[PDB]
Amino acid sequence: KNYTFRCLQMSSFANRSWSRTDSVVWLGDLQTHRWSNDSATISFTKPWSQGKLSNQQWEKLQHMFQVYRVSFTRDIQELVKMMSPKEDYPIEIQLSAGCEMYPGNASESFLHVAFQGKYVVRFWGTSWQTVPGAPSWLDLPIKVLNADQGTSATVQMLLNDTCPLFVRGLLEAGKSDLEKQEKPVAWLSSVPSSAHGHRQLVCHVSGFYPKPVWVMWMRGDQEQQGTHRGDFLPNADETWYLQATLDVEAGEEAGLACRVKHSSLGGQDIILYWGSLHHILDAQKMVWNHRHHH
């Protein structure tokens, strides 16, 4: 329902001379743009990545970002000379800029900066601001960055006006891809538990899109409260993988079922019963020597 658009900048500074800035752009869980240090121009990872903008509008926006990339690099290179030797190389900067789109003609725009892995500076209103609990030696660099009224004025515009206008048109351009439904495929496996006489029943469910899914170990109408929902692991084909774990006492496996509910199925949930002939037939297709197991 609510889509967050984020531009992620990864700037690595090894020493006084060596540096590289690489960026990626997302609209929900789908990558829209790619820009490597070795690349002069921004690359599209979707046919609708330009949105509703013109080849002129996009090129003007591009050049702006092209001078920003060379400028930023020297700008923080000079901020390390300012703080020197309070902060020394290697340095890692991370920028997360963008906007979240809410129902109605309304949105919230953000610009968060993390230094050496920790979030320290944000752009808020008309200026750069240090977040609470940020180191005091960041005050002078932020005072110097706030002295630059041209960058401040363009960043104000880029967040307030450009981000909502670009994304409103980005969602319309990529409606078919975002609303695409990919049916999940589930399989069962078992591993030994950390506890003696126990077994860890694993329900692998892969290739589902969109991300929201429901996976549970059942015993009839009883949701097994010991079922552990894993993290969402991505697939290379822009789909998702998730596995639900259940620690059972060896011998209690019979009766259990992995039930998975997804938007793509249309009410027809996948009910995967343990001791079933489909599982017996499946289990035999994936046998091995168990060498180098966990």
Epitope: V67, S71, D75, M82, K143, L145, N146, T151
Partner: T-cell receptor, first 112, second 113 residues
Amino acid sequence: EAAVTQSPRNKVAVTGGKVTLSCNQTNNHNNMYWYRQDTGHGLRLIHYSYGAGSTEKGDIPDGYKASRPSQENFSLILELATPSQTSVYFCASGDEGYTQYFGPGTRLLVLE
Amino acid sequence: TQVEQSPQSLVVRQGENSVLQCNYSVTPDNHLRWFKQDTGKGLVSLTVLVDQKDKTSNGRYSATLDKDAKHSTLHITATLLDDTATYICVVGDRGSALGRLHFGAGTQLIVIP
């Protein structure tokens, strides 16, 4: 209202002798700059500082050393003077802003 | 050369107008400053232009800026004999202390009585 003073106004040196061009500012400006003006060029940046203790290399730093002992003073040291260093040297200072406030200059002649 | 000033030298009759040109390739270009430098003297600022299409005035000194054509022009109307000096064009690449200044070679103005 934002002044920068330099010493000396004129200097003569021997090729291989130490020369120290001094600059002073009482504006409480954090950043200070050392330039040299030559016929056919614009002012070229030799060294610069971001505060007391800091000394960063400029576009043309070979043959020059720099020293910022405090907020007020910034020096340009020529441990081994050469006739190519015969120039007129300008000093500047500034705060977080873009404006640089220039000094009256220093004529340096390096003779054999 | 990132900042070029034309002509190298200009001669004007006392009371006539003088036009000095500045053309640059500095990227980015935050502002353009015009300095007056008397022989053996320091750099005195005359005017600063900051917008894409800017126009400024300091009484007798007027200047333009076209950041698209990356060109500025300085107008000295009704030149006095005391205007005999070098006029230098500077381009700053940031709106703060982080920026570098890119100085022109100057144009020598000679006011003849």
